[PDB]
Amino acid sequence: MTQSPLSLPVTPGEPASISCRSSGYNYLDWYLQKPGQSPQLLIYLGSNRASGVPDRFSGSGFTLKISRVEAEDVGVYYCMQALQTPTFGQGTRLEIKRTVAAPSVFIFPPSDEQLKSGTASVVCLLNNFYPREAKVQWKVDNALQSGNSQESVTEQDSKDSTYSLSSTLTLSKADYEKHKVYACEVTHQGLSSPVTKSFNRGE
Amino acid sequence: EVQLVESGGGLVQPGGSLRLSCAASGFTFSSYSMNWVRQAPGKGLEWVSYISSSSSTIYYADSVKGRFTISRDNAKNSLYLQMNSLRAEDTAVYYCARVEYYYDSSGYYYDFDYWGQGTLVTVSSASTKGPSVFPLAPSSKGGTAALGCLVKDYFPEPVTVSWNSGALTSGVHTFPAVLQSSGLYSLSSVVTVPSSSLGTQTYICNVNHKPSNTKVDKKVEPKS
């Protein structure tokens, strides 16, 4: 049975402690898996730092300790029990609690090229926001859309600690051509009132 | 530099077989023990198999015993994973990893010091399909503009997107793919650029879908 990593929210500059969560300590190693990368060795033999691992990381009996958390520490940390055969514990994903940052919103009409194919995709971009909780709502001719959109969100950025989100509304060509006003409405803690970006088909 | 480069991942029908390879360079491969480790999408790391430097010692995880075979060819600087009777729960990114050992009067200890980039295995009965690439044109906003590319209706994962053949990385966001109702994936890649340069600069997204041997460079420009 597979397990999704656990989320540990931490404030930058404050300490964090990560339990091995396996379910002396010379047999214990720690790995960090930054977004989109392979695991990299952090701590070996319980409390030795791999080269280039900053002062702030240390092991103790059994947890991993970060004295002050920085933006570059985002990722999933994995404890490994290096016995006759190795085993990895459940991951812990650090969530860096930066200041609130509102999203920049952009709406994209379907390309002329795609319409030639019989399908229309309308895209709404929410760029570089924090916290993660942002909501998108689609309206077509001032009518709430239900069941015809999907979204995905990037992992937290290693430099500015923000997220971005992309939402796609999918309609047939026939439906797209039957309506005029396309809008995505965004609610987020950084916005004192919701932001709407829209266009009219045919400009 | 030490490098481990995996290959052989891709789509395979349930019950089929597939062979992974891990090509080692930049160190004496014959002296090191190696492991395979895998990661299901959105899940944790799971150790798969172990082979000592001279193949005398081999271990398997219970989840793959009797179906997977680890081997190596030291003269060819290669590590292999032969996977048979593949099931849906075998879908994962597979990594090769090199073992570093420590010894003292009480015994031996180890960690994994170098890892490959990983190769994705998809166990599914669905068919391979190359994507379409459509532009996300910069709006008439001058401020900060956004543009991108919609990579739509492909299978299996993954696709790679770069901008200007890698010259543009500042401000690029490539989003995780979504699985559409049709069983085909769709993802988008976007960039924010100074809208003051939408006429002078030329932006191209380079889309590559190896599972279908598809390579697209679509120029993205604003519409009149």
Residue numbers in the entry:
A (entry chain B): 4 to 26, 33 to 70, 75 to 216
B (entry chain A): 1 to 141, 145 to 227
The authors write:
One of the most attractive TBV targets is Pfs25, a glycophosphotidylinositol-linked protein expressed on the surface of ookinetes, which develop from the fertilized zygote. Pfs25 is important for ookinete survival in the protease-rich mosquito midgut, and Pfs25 assists in the invasion of the midgut epithelium and maturation of the oocyst. When present in a blood meal, anti-Pfs25 antibodies significantly inhibit the development of oocysts in an in vivo standard membrane feeding assay (SMFA). We determine the co-crystal structures of four human antibodies bound to Pfs25, and describe three novel protective epitopes on Pfs25, including the most potent mAb yet described from any organism.
Notably, gl2544 does not bind Pfs25 with appreciable affinity up to the µM range as a Fab and only with 2.5 ± 1.1 µM apparent binding avidity as an IgG; consequently, it fails to show any detectable inhibition in SMFA at a maximum tested concentration of 375 µg/mL. To understand the structural basis of affinity maturation, we solved the crystal structures of the unliganded 2544 Fab and unliganded gl2544 Fab at 2.4 and 2.0 Å resolution, respectively. Comparison of the gl2544 structure with Pfs25-bound 2544 and unliganded 2544 revealed that the heavy chains are structurally similar, with a main-chain RMSD < 2.5 Å throughout the variable region, with the exception of the HCDR3, which displays major differences (nearly 12 Å in RMSD for certain residues) (top). The germline HCDR3 adopts an extended conformation in contrast to 2544, which bends at the loop apex. In the unliganded gl2544 structure, Y100G stabilizes an extended HCDR3 conformation, which would be unfavorable for Pfs25 binding and likely explains the lower affinity for this reversion. The light-chain arrangement varies considerably more between the gl2544 and 2544 antibodies (bottom). In contrast to the light-chain N terminus that shapes the binding site of 2544, the light-chain N terminus of gl2544 adopts an elongated conformation that points away from the paratope. In addition, the apex of κCDR1 is disordered in the germline structure, in contrast to 2544 where the κCDR1 is an ordered component of the binding site. From our comparative structural studies, we propose that there is an interconnectedness between the light-chain N terminus, κCDR1 and κCDR3 where somatic hypermutations in the κCDR3 result in stabilizing light-chain components in an optimal configuration for engaging Pfs25, from an otherwise flexible conformational ensemble in the germline antibody. The very low affinity of gl2544 for Pfs25 suggests that efficient vaccine elicitation of 2544-like antibodies might benefit from the design of a slightly modified Pfs25 antigen with appreciable affinity for 2544-like naive B cells.
